[PDB]
Design a binder for these strands. Structure first.
Ligand SMILES: [K+]
Ligand SMILES: [K+]
Ligand SMILES: [K+]
Ligand SMILES: [Mg+2]
Ligand SMILES: [Mg+2]
Ligand SMILES: [Mg+2]
Ligand SMILES: [Mg+2]
Ligand SMILES: [Mg+2]
Ligand SMILES: [Mg+2]
Ligand SMILES: [Mg+2]
Ligand SMILES: [Mg+2]
Lengths: 175, 48, 175, 110, 205, 122
RNA sequence: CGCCUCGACCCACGUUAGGCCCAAGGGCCCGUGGGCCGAAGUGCAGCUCCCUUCCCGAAUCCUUUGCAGACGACUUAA
RNA sequence: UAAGCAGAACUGGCGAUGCGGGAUGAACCGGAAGCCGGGUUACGGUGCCCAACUGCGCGCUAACCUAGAACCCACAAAGGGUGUUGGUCGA
RNA sequence: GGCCGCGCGCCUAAAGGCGUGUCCCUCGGGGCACUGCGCUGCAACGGCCUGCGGGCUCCCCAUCCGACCCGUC
């Protein structure tokens, strides 16, 4: 509940802000109606907040899509705000993908991914426009299968889909 | 209440009683109980 | 607690006739302070000749149970109005506070005699030693070897989350 | 057991009880829904905002499919015992009361 | 009162020693919500107030009849299952198509006819007499009331029910032998895989 | 011949409350519906018998023991683990345990239960 | 009886002033891609780039009768 | 004698007014109103019909008279009871 | 549930954000402040577009709720 504009300072931004007078900047057709021109908007929409239970290397259950119920490891949160996930593709067959923060559930099981390089993966990599994608996927699992093998039973856990069964109350389950 | 369990008929039925099963006895082929009577001839039929 | 005990102090308005009038105090049982002061001015008008318009309210303080962890025997002398006449009666109760006894008294009068709160006047309240208790059903709980079973169990789930319409077998309860 | 059909279930089964009602008039803008396993007004808050789908079979094919879907969400609790109010894009047909609805977990706060 | 929410194909309720109007109230809500309910052993439903009060209540009901054409008037069913059917109908908007459909999902029987003799029969906790009635107060059984007012199939119901209980008693003896065999099997299989089942120990009941 | 009575020293289990699952000792009886109950971790208060389930444990005390006297009897009469090692007290314990298990542990319980189940059949 | 143009998993009787219990609040499930000891029965890997439902021989009429009848219907015969 | 009778005083109401409750009803209780979305209340209710607890708590009652169960309101009396439960004053 | 009008003329930083001097405040670190001119319709992504697609104020039917026949004294 912090008041950013609590004080009339405005100078911690532009300390050397004592500057001079501003300098203000044929149609070939006239539209017959006074339409205010559309310029690009100068508003910064304050990027989305990551859920505090999702941290790099934590496990996610997918809630919708063609991979509903897939137990998947979380890697990174992209600039657009979509989480970066991998299956990995060897165990459950889920490739590298970006998923919305909704449609996933953050479990309390974690994996260390510190020595894993996820840098070239970003929003531009998923631009709607494959052999090298197979290589990138191939070189990101072998860096992660071993850490999955480090924890007992984590491999068979990641290779199974989550499902609700008789008598299961999602609002009581710990995960 | 009471319910009919099953019924067993005799091998020979006169035509007087077989007329009771027809609205028009003389226009029909008079086939009533003709195949039922065959159980009394074989041995599987007698078993039933 | 539903009922509270208050000590209300007031007097007639200081007038040139007296200028130092007498002080009157009462111990009244009410649900809050506003209802305690109203009942005080009711008794001052009817018992003395000082009503609220000619009087001054000096103090109002709530009385509290000294030891709310022990069990006392509580006698209450009361005046109540029935459908035909007025009668006074003596009642005895067992409680950890005199507040509970007064709530018990009001509930019992409502059930056994169909008498509402307005038609009741608490004449006197006191604590009675177990040697001097008069009513039965108070002495029978003075047994130091008091022993009995629970003849009505009220089989129910604990927190309403475990409630189901159907059950696979009949309950077994014993005492 | 070797069964066929759906392999995973990521929804809980709800039943439509009716409409927001009084003794003398009713309101189609909100439906009353009972979710399996939800027994209190307090644990309804977990499901508040969760998406809901009503699935029924129509008579003609639409996209080479004979099944239609109407989407809604859980809006608030109704009463003390776990029944909830739900708002759908279009009001549910009164013929749908007594039928089944699917309550997902798609908008997740956890 | 809302529905069960259990969303099954059909629930079979063993009506023995339930209070009639409290059982009918819960069943009516289930039917109105879309559940199929099968009620068996309707001859052993209980009504508070003994036989005498319940019998004269029926006799007053038996008095009611259309003066000019009785076969049009109220129909007074004598069997316990039809009596419970009519008690439930009184709690349902049965002149609407919704209540017509609701009442078509209810099946009521005297005794336990097949196939429900081999299925699971549940109970309603808040309709059971043992939780609803003080132990000293009077009550009667539905079959006793029905027998007093014209029902004539109490003997065949009783004879069939004795035969059913004999068969169930034999199936119970067999199930106990298979349970002792099972406990020996889980004991021997406990040591053979003793190491693997360490995680199940703290939740063993 | 009933099995459990309420008297001075009966250990009871609180059902149906915020304090559900806690153990209290009956130290005094108010009337037919209420009893004074005292525990190691709470101040003495009266409770309705409708919210108490009597256990099979009973300790030795007088009517109004001090808190220190109550603690000693609850140790001389070894109540905490007698409650916990009984099947009744155990059921409440593992009910908490099962609900506490998270998704990964529940998947491992499934792996162990399947292994255990196939061994019984063999 | 005769005659043929979305795991839909689960069987004790009986009693609650009694039979370890104190609710199936359980248990089970790779959960992971010939008598019916007749109430008789359905019996014992990607790019699908971030959600779009998870698609599984007689009868009738015309004729006859009169044990029937307002007419139909009914009992007969052909 | 009384009357949903006949006649006056003050105010409100119906007539001229829907809407929620009183099962139903000109007048009773609540409340007065453009077409809507969201939130909350009044009166009245939360076993089913019927939306909302078979909720938490103490007593009383047992009706072999159709026990009893919502202002107006749809009735009951004098008098009785060794039915049962509280009291008061006495031997 | 309904709505979409701070940011840059210094630098670094995906971006949120940080980075100057002055006086005062104490007890570690801030606070109140410099105020000079201008410009000034929030976004991201998806499916579909001649089809068994979308819509509908039109017609018929089903269901739930509501609903007594107008005029008149
Ligand atoms: K046939
Ligand atoms: K009396
Ligand atoms: K006229
Ligand atoms: Mg309701
Ligand atoms: Mg008759
Ligand atoms: Mg007029
Ligand atoms: Mg008029
Ligand atoms: Mg509103
Ligand atoms: Mg109750
Ligand atoms: Mg009325
Ligand atoms: Mg009298």
């Amino acid at each position: 509940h912090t008041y950013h504009r609590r004080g009339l300072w405005a100078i911690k931004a532009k300390h050397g802000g004592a500057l001079p007078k501003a300098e203000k900047p044929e149609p070939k057709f006239y539209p017959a109606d006074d339409v205010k021109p559309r310029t690009v908007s100068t508003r910064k929409p304050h990027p989305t907040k990551l859920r505090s239970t999702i941290t790099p290397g934590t496990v996610l259950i997918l809630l919708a899509g063609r991979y509903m119920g897939k137990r998947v490891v979380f890697l990174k949160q992209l600039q657009s705000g979509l989480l970066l996930i991998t299956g990995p593709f060897k165990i459950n067959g889920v490739p590298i993908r970006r998923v919305n923060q909704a449609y996933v559930i953050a479990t309390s099981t974690k994996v260390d991914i510190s020595k894993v390089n996820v840098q070239k993966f970003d929003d531009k990599y998923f631009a709607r426009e494959p052999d090298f994608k197979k290589d990138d996927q191939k070189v990101i699992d072998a860096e992660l299968i071993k850490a999955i093998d480090a924890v007992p039973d984590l491999k068979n856990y990641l290779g199974a889909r989550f499902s609700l069964r008789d008598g299961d109350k999602p609002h009581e389950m710990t995960f | 209440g009471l319910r009919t369990l099953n019924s067993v008929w005799a091998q020979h039925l006169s035509e007087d009683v077989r007329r009771r099963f027809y609205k028009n006895w003389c226009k029909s082929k008079k086939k009533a109980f003709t195949k039922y009577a065959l159980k009394y001839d074989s041995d599987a039929g007698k078993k039933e | 607690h539903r009922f509270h005990q208050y000590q209300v102090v007031g007097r007639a308005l200081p007038a040139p006739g007296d200028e130092q009038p007498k002080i009157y105090r009462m111990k009244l049982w009410a649900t809050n302070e506003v209802r305690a002061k109203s009942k005080f001015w009711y008794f001052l008008r009817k018992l003395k000749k000082v009503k609220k318009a000619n009087g001054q309210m000096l103090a109002i303080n709530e009385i509290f149970e000294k030891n709310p962890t022990t069990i006392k025997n509580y006698g209450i002398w009361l005046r109540y109005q029935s459908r035909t006449g007025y009668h006074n009666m003596y009642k005895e109760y067992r409680d950890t506070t005199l507040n509970g006894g007064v709530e018990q008294m009001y509930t019992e009068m409502a059930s056994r005699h169909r008498v509402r709160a307005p038609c009741i006047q608490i004449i006197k309240t006191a604590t009675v030693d177990f040697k001097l208790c008069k009513r039965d059903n108070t002495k029978q709980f003075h047994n130091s070897k008091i022993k009995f079973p629970l003849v009505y169990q009220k089989v129910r789930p604990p927190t309403r989350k475990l409630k189901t319409t159907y059950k696979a077998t009949r309950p077994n309860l014993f005492m | 057991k070797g069964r066929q059909g759906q392999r995973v279930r990521l929804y809980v089964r709800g039943t439509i009880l009716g409409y927001k009602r009084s003794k003398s008039n009713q309101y189609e803008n909100t439906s009353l829904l009972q979710i399996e396993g939800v027994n209190t007004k307090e644990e309804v808050g977990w499901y508040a905002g969760k998406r809901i789908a009503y699935v029924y079979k129509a008579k003609t094919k639409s996209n080479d499919s004979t099944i239609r879907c109407i989407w809604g969400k859980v809006t608030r609790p109704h009463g003390n015992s776990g029944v909830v109010r739900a708002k759908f894009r279009s009001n549910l047909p009164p013929t749908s009361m007594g039928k089944k609805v699917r309550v997902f977990m798609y908008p997740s706060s956890i | 009162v809302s529905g069960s929410g259990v969303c099954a194909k059909r629930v079979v309720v063993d009506a023995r020693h339930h209070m009639l109007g409290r059982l009918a109230s819960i069943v009516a809500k289930e039917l109105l919500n879309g559940q199929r309910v099968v009620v068996v052993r309707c001859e052993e439903i209980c009504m508070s107030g003994g036989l005498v009060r319940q019998k004269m209540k029926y006799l007053r009901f038996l008095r009611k009849r259309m003066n000019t054409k009785p076969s049009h008037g109220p129909i007074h069913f004598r069997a316990p299952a039809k009596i419970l059917w009519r008690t439930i109908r009184g709690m349902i908007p049965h002149k609407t198509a919704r209540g017509e459909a609701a009442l078509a999902r209810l099946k009521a029987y005297e005794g336990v006819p097949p196939p429900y003799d081999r299925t699971k029969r549940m109970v309603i906790p808040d309709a059971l007499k043992v939780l609803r009635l003080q132990p000293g107060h009077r009550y009667c059984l539905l079959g006793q009331l029905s027998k007093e007012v014209g029902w004539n199939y109490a003997d065949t119901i009783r004879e069939l029910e004795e035969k059913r209980k004999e068969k169930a008693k034999v199936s119970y003896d067999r199930r106990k032998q298979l349970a002792k065999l099972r406990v020996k099997a889980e004991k021997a299989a406990e040591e053979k895989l003793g190491t693997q089942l360490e995680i199940l120990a703290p939740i063993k009941y | 011949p009933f099995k459990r009575f309420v008297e001075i020293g009966r250990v009871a289990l609180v059902n149906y409350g915020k304090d559900y699952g806690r153990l209290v000792v009956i130290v005094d009886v108010v009337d037919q519906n209420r009893a004074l109950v005292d525990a190691p971790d709470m101040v003495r208060c009266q409770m309705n018998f409708k919210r108490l389930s009597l256990t099979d444990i009973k300790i030795d005390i007088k009517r109004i023991p001090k808190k220190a006297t109550l603690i000693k009897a609850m140790e001389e009469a070894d109540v905490k683990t007698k409650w916990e090692n009984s099947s009744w007290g155990k059921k409440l314990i593992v009910q908490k345990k099962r609900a506490a298990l998270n998704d990964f542990d529940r998947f491992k319980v499934m792996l162990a239960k399947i292994k255990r189940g196939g061994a019984i059949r063999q």
